[PDB]
Amino acid sequence: SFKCVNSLKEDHNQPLFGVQFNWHSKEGDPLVFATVGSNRVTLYECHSQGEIRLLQSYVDADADENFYTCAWTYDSNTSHPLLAVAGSRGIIRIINPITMQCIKHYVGHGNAINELKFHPRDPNLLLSVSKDHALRLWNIQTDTLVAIFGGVEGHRDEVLSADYDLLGEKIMSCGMDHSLKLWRINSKRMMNAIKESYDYNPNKTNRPFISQKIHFPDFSTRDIHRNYVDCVRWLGDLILSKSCENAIVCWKPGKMEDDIDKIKPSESNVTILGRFDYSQCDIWYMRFSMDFWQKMLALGNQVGKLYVWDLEVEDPHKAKCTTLTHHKCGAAIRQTSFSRDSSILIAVCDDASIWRWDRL
């Protein structure tokens, strides 16, 4: 029951590739979201009567930078929100959302960064996925690279998406090699690495911080999709992943009754629990998103149509779909974002337009 209440367009006329509401905003503060596109990050505030108030932007010094992704966290000691952005240059920037100052940056990836994700229980643990075939886990409190997830048995082509499970114990990643790979970060090795990353103070020691080199996933499959897998999210112990085949697939590793934490790296079976089809979304680089409670799933297509699946049903394949269109919204929707209370849905487009849908 969403209604389109407003729209606007950014003056660069370049694609907006990412949008994220700040779910770490304090009580009583207005709902804020960020857009990324061109070499720009922009913050907007949502107000009554559909108003989208423009606040302030961060413009990268490199006019050739192209931001692909962003994610919110908060500064661990001060509680003030932080915004991480990254894109074609392969550089993570940490932005102060109040002043839009770049506080610090992380270099290391060999090519573009395609997605950023923060650990669900630890606001300092930032996951990056890169065109260089690797994932990196960063501790943005001590400014340390904790681990590199790669190798010959890592991804063999550009990594496009990844996601932490609910408790932050494991990561699922996906990309251009058609594969989805599980990486457990609750192993004794990775837990110890995270602890050491917090005890590292370069002014109190002579050593560099040693990163972990993780070369072997804990599960891998190429049997879900037959093309680029450009978005992946956990839904409990299940996985939602999409390709460019007009399909979000709900699946799990192993057979039907196999526990996710009993899965071994040699597991060769998967179980398909359903498929959410849609129309006209066969270009690469389109994300679906879920609300905070994971009751709803949203995806835009390449002609401006929005699909919303109600996941509050007993089984994945029973999901109920509703569609949202506007006669003036005809450009490809790259990503969407629900506000934390799920009352607002924002969609961003290849023509730099922004569309606001309010639950009425």
Ligand SMILES: Cc1cc(CN(C)C)ccc1-c1cnc(NCc2c(F)ccc3c2CCO3)n2cc(C#N)nc12
């Ligand atoms: C730079 C770019 C140009 C175009 C063509 N113009 C005309 C529209 C299409 C696509 C990308 C493009 C977009 N988004 C990423 N990444 C981020 C990413 C993703 F990884 C997976 C899904 C997803 C996104 C954004 C929205 O969902 N890109 C990466 C490269 C390269 N190389 N090109 C692009």
